[PDB]
Write a protein that binds this ligand. Structure first.
Ligand SMILES: Cc1cn([C@H]2C[C@H](O)[C@@H](COP(=O)(O)O)O2)c(=O)[nH]c1=O
Ligand SMILES: Cc1cn([C@H]2C[C@H](O)[C@@H](COP(=O)(O)O)O2)c(=O)[nH]c1=O
Ligand SMILES: [Mg+2]
Ligand SMILES: [Mg+2]
Lengths: 208, 208
């Protein structure tokens, strides 16, 4: 089973991944986890991150360039994903293809039925052959609360300064709204929308 | 030995590669050839080409995005290049890293000592670990003549329509001038500047 955890910056995704993996393991399932972008493991992922911190000239000003780098990062992990799905009961992703649709649409002021989300579908699922997830879980959080979490993280960690997307409050709000539409539409596969108070034991039961 | 053939669009590079490989083989050397971008062999190369023909939204409007895709294409061929250099006497490339420096600088109206060429050095040779060529051969041609060749090619071949860079005459002229500076500077390794009338037998002797 392939599960993707989605949502805006500072939504609590990495914590939900650890809680969910604990819940599956408590129920006897083997769990593997992977997080995109794969910082350190691909040049595409690292250049993208650096571009969001102000490097690499005009790269980050192109919406489709940034999307392409994240897609190329995932394309480098296809055989890895397919291998994990063979070896493990549950594979849990911290961000996946839907992050590219939500952020790209939001940067362009488009909705979930617009051009960017359709491009992401065409490139990543069809052309690059990335598997569609069995479940995509939207961790829906107020944009204000998520933004406070990102700010807090940068304050206490010098290696977690906010990037260009995190600093853009209105982008984060628009991205939350596109994500809600993608879930309602069942984009890429079925979605669950959960809040910050979701129970990990029940959540894993729904997904099992 | 690793040789790169460089120069503007329509300069006659692919023909020089075939003539040069013939000259080396006539002298008893095994020759392997590779052409960048590697259309068909990498997603980065294909997306870049499609972006230059008007696809993928705002991708082609970023100079650093386009450079990054060509660099990522080459990064996918590093082990291939290293393998060819082990197995063959002469490896001949139709375009290599210097194409990224010349076109990127030209798009930004920079010269060979500017920021883009320095970025290409830092990313491709140092960070990605692409081998520096033993020889880079600049096939220097009038920009007007090269532009006529590109136009002619599109006229007789429906699968060779000109791309955004080929249609930009002033970009092609600026790119020729940056290339001349890169050669004079010995950027990336030693250069030879040849004309359209260069003798392939003598050229191969110089390079052998
Ligand atoms: C994985 C991914 C992230 N992004 C964004 C969301 C974040 O603001 C940023 C870096 O991801 P991060 O928040 O997980 O660590 O890039 C995309 O636009 N597309 C993608 O495919
Ligand atoms: C290989 C390469 C090509 N280019 C350009 C030159 C051409 O106008 C175009 C496509 O290459 P092509 O002319 O060999 O077939 O992209 C770069 O800007 N950087 C590179 O690294
Ligand atoms: Mg973030
Ligand atoms: Mg061309």
């Amino acid at each position: 089973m392939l599960i993707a955890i989605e949502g805006v910056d500072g939504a609590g995704k990495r914590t939900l991944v650890e809680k969910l993996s604990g819940a599956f393991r408590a129920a006897g399932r083997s769990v593997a986890t992977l997080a995109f972008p794969r910082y350190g493991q691909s040049v595409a992922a690292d250049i993208a991150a650096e571009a969001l911190h102000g490097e690499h000239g005009d790269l980050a000003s192109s919406v489709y360039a940034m999307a392409t780098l994240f897609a190329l990062d995932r394309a480098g992990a296809v055989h890895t994903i397919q291998g994990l799905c063979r070896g493990y009961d549950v594979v849990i992703l911290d961000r996946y293809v839907a992050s590219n649709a939500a952020y790209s649409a939001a940067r362009l002021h488009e909705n979930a039925a617009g051009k960017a989300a359709a491009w992401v579908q065409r490139i990543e699922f069809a052309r690059l052959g990335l598997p569609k997830p069995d479940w995509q879980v939207l961790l829906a959080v107020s944009a204000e609360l998520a933004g406070e979490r990102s700010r807090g993280r940068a304050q206490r960690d010098p290696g977690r300064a906010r990037d260009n997307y995190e600093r853009d409050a209105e982008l984060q709000q628009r991205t939350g709204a596109v994500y809600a539409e993608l879930a309602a539409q069942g984009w890429g596969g079925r979605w669950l929308v959960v809040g910050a108070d979701v129970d990990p034991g029940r959540l894993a039961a729904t997904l099992a």
